[model samples]
Structures are given as structure tokens and as C-alpha cells.
Target: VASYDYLVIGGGSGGLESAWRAAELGARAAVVESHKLGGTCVNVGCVPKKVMWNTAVHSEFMHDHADYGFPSCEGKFNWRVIKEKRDAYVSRLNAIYQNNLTKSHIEIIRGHAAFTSDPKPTIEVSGKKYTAPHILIATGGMPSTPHESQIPGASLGITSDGFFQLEELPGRSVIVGAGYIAVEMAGILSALGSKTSLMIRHDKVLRSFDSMISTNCTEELENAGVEVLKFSQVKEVKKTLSGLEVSMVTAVPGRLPVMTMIPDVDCLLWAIGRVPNTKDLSLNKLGIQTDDKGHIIVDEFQNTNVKGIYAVGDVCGKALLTPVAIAAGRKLAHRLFEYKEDSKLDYNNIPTVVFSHPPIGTVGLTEDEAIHKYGIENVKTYSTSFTPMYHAVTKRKTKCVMKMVCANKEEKVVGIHMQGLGCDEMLQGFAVAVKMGATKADFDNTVAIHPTSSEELVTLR
Candidate 1:
């Protein structure tokens, strides 16, 4: 049996950061991973996805080149070339992560780790037993797919994982879901020249986001030539000689479920949601309680019900973002190895950006949420919509919408949301200001940068 000061169960972003932080604090730390060193974000999730998004962005620019006074631009997107380069980039990242772990003096255990009941908080990897007093479950999550039982022939469809594996661009694609993943995938596929259809079970995509963003994103998807199948869902998927057939149901009340089949779809993607990776850890035998969906239950301080056992990231189902996991992991390392009792992640006001066609960046509560919390009378919202200067000369124009939700008499800026061309890069600075409890007056007091979409936030009436 081997022993260490810290043992991280997964080698994803969360687990890697936790182990590194623990090592930096003079703890003998090790991370056990079954796959590549960097896990999903570096392997299949953010890294590769961003590459595709950039390609889509390039496609957009090519479409607007003539409008930008460039001589007629003619080009065909080579999916094979980009995919190869992206795969290589991911490989390089994986190597860099492994080297960093080695330099940090953190041991990298390459195997699937499971808990052993005999000893106290022991892990078994490939018939090798390891022990640690401080154990972190940072296994992360996997893209979810509907059960074959839930929908007949649901297995015929693929998840986001499969989308990344696709070598040739799909000709006709049907994406099922209403979440960010669904929107992103649909946007990329369509922007890259696929005939993409997004089938949401609701009226819009990104329902959990601000209603303005949700509404605008829906319109943007349609404007980008993506077929938005509102109030629809996939009833079943089946193989066809040409390609595939997707049977859909438009579930509206007071009428029988309207059934239809989309034929000759080369790809059917399921971006419904993600499921936490906690099933194979053998947590039940150790009395580690998980929610119904198998997400590890962790307290604010990253503590599980059992002492010395903790979890962070998607496995815990809190935040479920890459940065959130990294922050929680580092904080947990400080709390456990550095003996900082109060060390924990501040979950509120974390900024997030979705890489849709035009992109979206938001931090803190939505306008509706602020009103619900602070009362309708106390909440004040400032909003503005304009075509950004970047689109001034372009025939194809997209609107940039910005909103600030404030609360109380002091008008503290509780939320900031925007969707536009450069909003993704514009959000970080504003998010810091909002996090520091900036008020509407404070924004007004500051000098606005001229001729930029971001300046709208400060100059909004």
C-alpha cells in the first residue's frame, strides 16, 4: 500500500489544481487519472470547442469581408485541416500538464481509482492500493445522452463527445436540447456550413439565463440560418440507408403530440445536459452520500459528510464550471494542507461566457432574479441595444444588448449581462467591478472608452 498527504481521484482541471496546490503547500500530493492528464477541458471540452468556435468566427469574417472593403474573399473551410491542428494542440496541452505535474513533484497515477472499504479512505487503482487522509473527488462529468428506454432508438444519437470526434463536417444535423451546449454546438455546426436544426423542448434556448439573452439568442440562432424547432423534442431516432431519421414530437397541450420525421440527417446530437462522474467510485460502501443524480454532496467548505473526504467541480454538481472547480480545489487544498479554516470559494458573482455565434457574457443575478430578491420596487435596470461599430459597414449586422440590474437605494450593480461580437472579452473587467459591489453611480462616474461596444455599459441610459 502507498500513502500520501493528499490524493485526488480524478486528473481533470479540478483534481490537477487541487493536487498542485497541495504540493505547493508542502504536502505529498498525487492525482489518479484514467485518461490524458488535462481531462475534459483540455481534451474534449473547452480547448477543442474553442478551436471550433474560432473557426466559426473566421467563417463569419469571411462572409463579411466584402462589407469590410476587402477584395472578394473566396475560400472553402477544410474541416480535416482544422481538426488535425486542434487535435495536435490538445495533445501538446496534455503533455504540458503532465510536465507541470512532474515539476510540481506531484505523482501522476494513471488508472481508474475506486474506494476500498477495508482501510480508512483508501483508493485502489489497477490492483494497487493507496491511502490518504485528505481525499478529493474531482472526477468531473460526462456529456449526457437520453436512455434508449426513454426514447426508442435514442442510442442512435450521439453526445457532445461524439461531436468532437467527427472528422468530416456533418451535412445535415439535428441537435436536441435547449441548454448552452445545444446552442453552442448548433452554432458551430451551422456556422461551419452544416445544415443544422436545433430542437428545443421549450420556446427558446438558454432558458436559465436572463430572459433578454434567452430571447435574443433564439433570434440570433434563427438569423444565422439555424432551423429553430421550438416546442419540440426528439421522440426517437433511427438509422436510414441515406443517413438517419429523427422522429420528433411537438408537445403542446390541448392537442395530440404532433409527430414528424426529419430524414437524411447525417448527425443527431444530444446536448441535453451533463451527468456527474461519481458512479464507479464505490461511494455507497463508504457512506459518501450523493444526490439522486449521483453528484457528490459537499458543503461550502468542500467537505463531504465524512471527515477528510471532500469533492469539487462537476462531480459535486455545484457551479460545474472549470474555473469554479479550480477555485474550489485550490481553496480546499489551503483549508486541508495549509490549515486555513476559513478557506473556501465564493460561489457568487462568477462570470461566465457562452461562445454562441455572437457570444454572451453574464455575471450575477438576472433582472428577474434581482427583482424577486430585492422586490420589484427596489430593483432598477438599465438597458441599451445598438449595432456595434464592427458591424456598421457590414451588410450582416448583429445587435449588441447590454443590461445592468441594480438593487436597493444605493443602486448596487448586482448583475451585468451582454450579448454581442466582443462581449466575451468585454465582460471580465466589468465582472470584477460588479464583484466589488460597484453601483450605477460608480459606473456613471467613470470615463467611458470611446467607439467600443463595452462603453455602452457605462453610458447606458
Candidate 2:
């Protein structure tokens, strides 16, 4: 049996943050991980996906080169070059993660961690018992892929993981889902010269976002040359001599269901949603409560009902972003080790960016949520739609849309949403202001940057 002051069961971003913070606070801590250290974000999700998005952006610029008085870019893309570089870069980070933990004096335990039948809250990793005063669950999540039982021959299709390992870009691709991942992959694939189709259940993608974003982005996808198959569901995917034959049905509320097959497709990707990684943790027998979808239940302070145990990251199922998990984990560590009583993350005004064709940046509530929370009478908005200056003389153009949702008598800024060139970095800066409880007047009083899409936020009326 091995013991420590703290044990973090998952070497992902959140787990590492908590463990490192505990060790920094002079607590003996250790981390247990069965796979790579950086979790989904490094190995498959964000790191690799960003590289691909960057590569796709090169193609996006190529389209507008002639308008900038340069000769048209005419070159063939080689997939192997970026794939090799991305894989090598991730491996270096993996090695660096190991070095960082070792240098911090945090023990790295290898193998799967399973909770045993011990009298106390102890975990058994590879047949060795380990216990700590506090154990954090930060195992993170995996891409949700449908099982073969749910849809016949679904195993033939791939999830986001498989997309990275692909040797060559698909000649023709069909992406399923209405979420950010779907929008991202479809945009990337289409931008990279794949004949792409996006399968969405509703009339627009990003249905959960503000309706303006939902409507505008859907049109942008079509404008970027993606076939938007609205009100569609995948029934089955079959392997054929040509490649893949995808059988799907479209059923609008008032229209009869229409069955169709997208034949000779090269890739059928699933980006439906993600489930919490609590399957192997054995939370059920330990009386650690979990929700219906198997996410570990936690209070505002990241504490589980079972004493001396906690959960952070995707396992908690609220705000499933890497930064959210990292913040929560570090806060918990400060509270636990440094004796800071109120060191909990304020789960509001978290900024997010989606790397679509033009990219999207958003922070705080949607228009609907603002009205719901503050009432329609007190809610007001400032919005604008215009082509960004970058696309002024270009034949290929993408418009920028911005909206600021305000609430109450003070017109406190409740949300800011937009999609356009440079909005990703723009939102990062503005998110600080919104998080500090800035009001509409605060934005109006701010000086605008010259001739930039970000300037729209400050000048909005």
C-alpha cells in the first residue's frame, strides 16, 4: 500500500493543475494516469484540431490572394507533412508533462485506478492500494461514437479521434451533429478541398447559441461550400467497393420523412456529444452519487457527497472546457491545502471560441437567457452586421456579426457574441471586461480600435 496527502486520478489538464497546486502548497501529492498526460485536449482534441484549423486557414487565404494583387495560389496539399509535424509536437509535450510532474516532486503512478472494497475511500491502481485525504477525479472525456447496436454498421464510421489518424483527407465527407465539433470539422474539411456535407437535425447549426449566431453560421457554412443537410439523421453506414454508403432520413416537423443514401462517401464522422468518463471509477458501489448520464455529482465547491473525494473537469458535466476544469482544480487545491475557505471558481462569463471557417467568439449569456433572467422589460441589446475590412476587395467574402446583450436598469453587459475574422482573439480581451461586471455604458465609453472588427464591440449601438 502506498499513501500520500493527495492523489489525483487522471493526468489530464485539471488533474495536473490540482496536483501541482497541492505540491506547491507543500503537500505531498501524486498523479495516476493510464494513458498520455495531456488528456483529450493535447493528444486528440484541441492541440491537433487547432493545427488542422490553422492549415485550413492557409487555404482560406489562398482564395483571396489574387485580390491582394498577388498571383493566385496554385499548389497541391500534402496531408502527411502536417500530420507528422503535429504528432511529433504532441509527443514532445507528452514528454514535457512527465518532466514537469517529476520536477515538481509529484509521484507519477501508472495504470488504471479502480476503487476497491476498502473500508475508507481508497483506490486500487494495478493491484496496489493507495489512499489520500483527498482524491480528485479528473479523468476527462472521450468523443461519443454510436455503438454498432444503435445504428447498424455504425462501427465503420469514425469519431474525432479517427479523424486525426487519417492518412489522407477524405475525398468526400459527411459529418453528423449540430454542435461545435460538427461545425468545426465540416468547416475544416470543406476549406481543405473535401466535398463535404453537414448533417444537422434542425434547420440551423449551433441551435443552443443565440438565434442570430445559429442562423448566420449555418448560412456561412453553405457559403463556404458545405452542403447543409437540414433535419437529417443517420440510419446506417455500410462499407462498399467504392468506399462508404451512408443511409439517412430527414424528417421535418410538418413534412414526411424522406429517406436517402449518400453513396461513395469517404468518411462519415460522428460529433454528436460527449459523455463523462466515470464508467471505470466504480462510483456506483462507493455511494458516490452521479447523474443519469453517469457524470459524478458535485456541489458548487467541487465536492462529492462522499467525504474526502471530489470531481472536476468533464466528469462533473458542467462547463466541459479545459480552462474551466483547470480553474476549478486549482481553486480546490488552494482551498484544501492553503486553508483558503472560499477558493471556488465563479462559474460565469466563461469565454469560448469555435474555429469555424471564420471562427466564433462568445462570452456570457445568450439573448434568450438574458431576457429570461432579467425579464424582457429590462433587457436591451446592441447589434451590427457588416463585412469586415479584410474582405473589402476580395471576391470571396465573409461577414461579421456582433451583439451585446444587456440587462436590468444599469444595462449590465450580460453577453457578447460574434463570428468573423479576428473575433477569436477579440473575445478573449473583451471577456475580461464582461467578467469584471462591466455595463453597457462601460463599453460605450471605451475608445474603439481603428478599422478592426473588434472595434465593433466598443462602438455598438
Candidate 3:
């Protein structure tokens, strides 16, 4: 058995951050990753999904160029070219991740890491063991495939990972779920010339978000030719002679099992949710506690119940976001290595982006959540929804929507939500202002960026 001062499991974003920070603080650090060095974000999550979205955007633009007073773009979609380029780009990212860890002086143990005891883990590769002191369980979460379904043969449904990595784009796809992934994929598939159908259990998609935002986005998705069936529960997906037969019953009994026989698209995708991967870690053996979902129990300090053992990223399952994991890992490093007692990560006002076909960026609470947290009377809301210029030329029916929530009593802006073109980068700057306690008056006083969709944020009431 070999040992080190800090053994970080999972070389994804959080793991690397912890390892580097520990070494920088004068501790001998090593990391064990079961897969590639970079975590989910770099490998198969945000980066790749963005590239695919960009490809879809280009395809949409080329189809609409003639309306912009330019010669007909008349460009055709070339799957061979798009796929080849995307593959090459992702490979480069993988290489860069591999190099980053090695260059940083972090020992890389490539294998599955299983915890044998609290703050102690053993790494096994094809049946060999490596040991270390103070093991940090950073192994991330994976897309979940639960057995239960409202419909039979639901096992055939695919998750985001399975959908995004498809070798061939489906000619038609029946997608389930209402999260950002579902919105984005429906856009991607529809934009890429696929006949797409979205089935959601609720009356509207994205209900967890602001109701108005969800309703507006639903209109856009439907306008894009995506069939959105709300308040419909799918009973099962059966393979039919044509392709697939989708059977669903509406909450209202008169609807019957609406059977829509769809052409066999290449796939059926699910963006429902991801379950944490922690069972094999043997937390019980070490007396490390986990929640109902098997996520590790940790306080704000990133420390598990057992001392010297830490859990970060998707495993701890706080926000289930890459940036959230990175910030937590970095702060844990500072507290452990740098010996600086900085406050825990300020989760509030942290910005997030969804790479849906149109893209969405948000910070702080939604209007409904704000009302629940800070009383309806104290919440002043500001919003703007307008058709973007890109749509004028492309005739894409989607519109941009942005909302700001201010605490009326304090006159301070507490939240901002954006959905549309250019909002991805725009939300970041706005988040900074919100973080600084900018007041509603401050936002009102700013000049609008002319001709841009994001200008609505400045002009909001």
C-alpha cells in the first residue's frame, strides 16, 4: 500500500481543484480518476453539448439567410462534416484535460476508487489496490435510469448522455421530461430537421421555473414545430411496424390513451434527472452518512461526518452543477491548505446557463420562489419579452424574455432570469451587479445595448 497527504478521487473539475489547491498549500497531493482527467463538464457535459448547439444554430441560420437581404444561403446540412469536427474538438479537450493534471504535479491514478474506510480509499484497476490518507470522494453523478415508469417498456427510453452521444441523428424523436435539457434537445432535434414530440406530465413545460417564462417558452417550442403535449402521461412506448407507437392518457379520463404512431426516429430521449453514483463507494463501511438519494452528507465546510474525509461535486449533490462543484472544491482547499477561513461559497446569486437551442441564463430566485422566500408584498418584479431581430430574418418564432426580481422594502435587486440569444454572456455581468447589491434604480439608470436582445435587461422596470 502507498499513501499521500491527500488522495482525491475523480479527476473531474472538483477533484483537480482540490488536488492543485492542496499541493499549492505545500501538501503532497494525488488524484485517482476512474475515467478521463476532466470531470463531466469537460468530457461529456457542457462543452460537447454547446458545440452541438452551435452546429444546430449554424444550420438554422443558413436556412434563413436569404430573408436577410443576402443571397440565399442554400447551404445544406452535412452530417459527416459536423460530426467529424465535433469529434475532433472533443478529443482535443480530452487531451488538454489530461495534460492539465500532469503539468500541475498531481499524481494521476487511472482506475475505479472504492472507499474502504472513512477518509481512506483503495484504488483498484483490473484487480490491484492503491491506498492513501485523507481520501476526497469527488466521483461525480451519472444520468439515472429508474425502473418505474407511467408507461410500459419505459426501459427503452434514453437519458441525456445517451441522446447527446448518438452516432446518427434520429429522423424523428419522442422526448420526455421538462427540464432545460429537454428544452434544448427538442430545439436541437427540431432545428436539425427532425420531427420532434415533447410529452410533459404538467400542463406546461419547465413548471419548476417561473410560470410565465414556462408558458412563453412553450409557445416558442410549439412554434418551432415541436409538438408539446401537456398534462399527458405516457403509458408506454411500443415498437410498431412504422417506428414507435406512443400511448398516453391525459389526466382527464375522456382523453383515453392517445396513441400517436410516430415514424421510427433514431431514438427516444429522456431529460428527467440524474441520480448520484455512490453505492459502490461503501460509505456504510466507513460509517459515512448519505441521504435518501445516496448523496454524501456534508456541511458547509465540505467535511463529511468523519474527519479528514471530504466529498464534493455531484457526489455531495448540492446543486448538481459543475461550477457549484468547482467553487466548493476550491473553498475546501483554501480552508484546508491555505488555512484561510473564508466564508462558504455564496450559493445565492450564482449564475447558471442552459444551452437550449435559444440558450438561457439565470441567477438567484424565480418569481414564484422569491414570493415564497421574501413575501409577495416585498417582491417587485420587472420583465420584458420581445421578438429578436434574428427571428425577423430567420422567421424563428422564439422570443427573448428577461425578468428581474427586486426586494421592494430594501430596493435591492435579488434575482435575474434570461432566456434568448446573447443572454448567456449577458447574465454573467448582470449577476455581478446583483452580487454587489445593485438596486433597481441602478439597473434602471443603465443604458441599453442597442439592437441586441439583451438590452431588455437595462430597460426593465
- CA-lDDT, candidates in order: 0.91, 0.91, 0.77
The Cα error of candidate 3 at residue 41, in Å, is 1.6
Winner on TM-score between 1 and 3 is: 1
Candidate 1: list runs displaced more than 4 Å.
Answer: 253-256
Clashes of each: 0, 0, 4
Cα lDDT, model 2, residue 397: 90
Per-model TM-score, in order, reads 0.98, 0.98, 0.92
Which portions of model 3 show Cα errors greater than 4 Å?
Answer: 73-76, 117-133, 148-151, 252-263, 391-394
Model 1's TM-score against the true structure: 0.98
User: What RMSD, rounded to one decimal, does every model reach?
Assistant: 1.0, 1.0, 2.4
Q: Which lDDT tens digits does candidate 2 get at residues 1-461? A: 67799999999989999999999999999999999898888998889999999999999898888899999868678888889998999999999999999999999899899887787899988888999989999988878888788889888888899999998989999999989999999998898888999999889999988888898899999998999999999988899999999999999899999999999999999999898888998876578999888888998899999999999999888988889999999999999999998999999999999999788889999999999998899899999999998888988999999999999989899999999999877887789999999998888998888988888888887
Model 1: per-residue lDDT, tens digit, 255-363?
6889999999999998988899888999976899989999998888989998889999989887878999999999999999888999999999999999998999999
* lDDT for position 160 in model 2: 93
**Which is superior by lDDT, 2 or 3?**
2
